[PDB]
Write an enzyme that holds these catalytic residues in place. Structure first.
Site, PDB file in Angstrom:
ATOM      1  N   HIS A  43      35.135  40.377  47.871  1.00 58.79           N
ATOM      2  CA  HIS A  43      35.475  40.557  46.470  1.00 58.79           C
ATOM      3  C   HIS A  43      36.617  39.630  46.094  1.00 58.79           C
ATOM      4  CE1 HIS A  43      39.020  43.628  46.290  1.00 58.79           C
ATOM      5  NE2 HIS A  43      39.055  42.993  47.452  1.00 58.79           N
ATOM      6  N   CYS A  97      43.987  40.734  46.122  1.00 57.99           N
ATOM      7  CA  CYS A  97      43.810  41.583  47.282  1.00 57.99           C
ATOM      8  C   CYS A  97      44.257  40.839  48.532  1.00 57.99           C
ATOM      9  CB  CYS A  97      42.338  41.972  47.401  1.00 57.99           C
ATOM     10  SG  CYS A  97      41.983  43.094  48.755  1.00 57.99           S
ATOM     11  N   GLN A 115      36.686  52.805  46.456  1.00 55.92           N
ATOM     12  CA  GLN A 115      36.758  53.399  45.127  1.00 55.92           C
ATOM     13  C   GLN A 115      35.356  53.434  44.534  1.00 55.92           C
ATOM     14  OE1 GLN A 115      40.829  51.024  44.098  1.00 55.92           O
ATOM     15  NE2 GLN A 115      40.140  52.551  42.605  1.00 55.92           N
ATOM     16  N   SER A 138      42.419  49.601  41.040  1.00 57.38           N
ATOM     17  CA  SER A 138      43.171  48.475  41.572  1.00 57.38           C
ATOM     18  C   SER A 138      43.242  47.331  40.587  1.00 57.38           C
ATOM     19  CB  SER A 138      42.576  47.962  42.887  1.00 57.38           C
ATOM     20  OG  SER A 138      42.243  49.023  43.766  1.00 57.38           O
TER      21      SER A 138
END
Ligand SMILES: Cc1cccc(C(=O)O)n1
Ligand SMILES: Cc1cccc(C(=O)O)n1
Ligand SMILES: Cc1cccc(C(=O)O)n1
Ligand SMILES: Cc1cccc(C(=O)O)n1
Length: 147
Positions: A43, A97, A115, A138
């Site tokens: 991601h 991240c 999540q 996030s």
């Protein structure tokens, strides 16, 4: 009719049909092709001032608004889809991240670990497919399913 999450939509610019996935926020002109215990995903996360932790390795204090984060995400998607940039390069450079150091790879995971919006998008992608903007606490994610 169509795989999970996919619906037909009408382009406002061209008037041609396209396909939109309300789980992954993916959109494409092509009719989508054709669930595992685990998937592997990478991601690219763009955090914003309402993120659960508005901090990252890129920026001690993340101040951009959620709208500004979405514009950044939309721009990265555009560059990935046009081939100007690859997902892995943008994740390594710009993901908020800590997985950025691994080209955004999160490894494999099951349902009940991430999540929920991220999980649902990941499991609705097919191998090789990319999501559109996916919102979690996030931030906003672009998700690439790799396995
Ligand atoms: C060129 C392109 C872009 C996005 C999805 C697809 C497909 O699912 O066939 N093809
Ligand atoms: C690597 C890093 C630095 C500062 C904050 C964070 C976080 O809370 O996600 N992570
Ligand atoms: C994610 C997004 C996009 C556009 C506007 C807003 C807002 O009004 O907060 N948020
Ligand atoms: C989820 C992930 C992947 C790769 C590195 C890290 C980290 O160093 O925190 N985290």
């Amino acid at each position: 009719k169509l795989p999970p999450g996919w619906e037909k939509a009408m382009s406002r610019s061209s008037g041609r049909v396209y396909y939109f996935n309300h789980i992954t926020n993916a959109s494409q002109w092509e009719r989508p092709s054709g669930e595992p215990a685990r998937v592997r995903c990478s991601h690219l996360l763009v955090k914003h001032s309402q993120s659960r932790r508005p901090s990252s390795w890129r920026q001690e204090k993340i101040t951009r608004t959620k709208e500004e984060a979405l514009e950044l995400i939309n721009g990265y998607i555009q560059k990935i889809k046009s081939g100007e940039e690859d997902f892995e390069s943008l994740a390594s450079q710009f993901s908020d991240c800590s997985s950025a150091k691994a080209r955004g790879d999160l490894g494999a995971f099951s349902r009940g670990q991430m999540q929920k919006p991220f999980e649902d998008a990941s499991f609705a992608l097919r191998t090789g497919e990319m999501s559109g903007p996916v919102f979690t606490d996030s931030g906003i994610h672009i998700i690439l399913r790799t396995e």
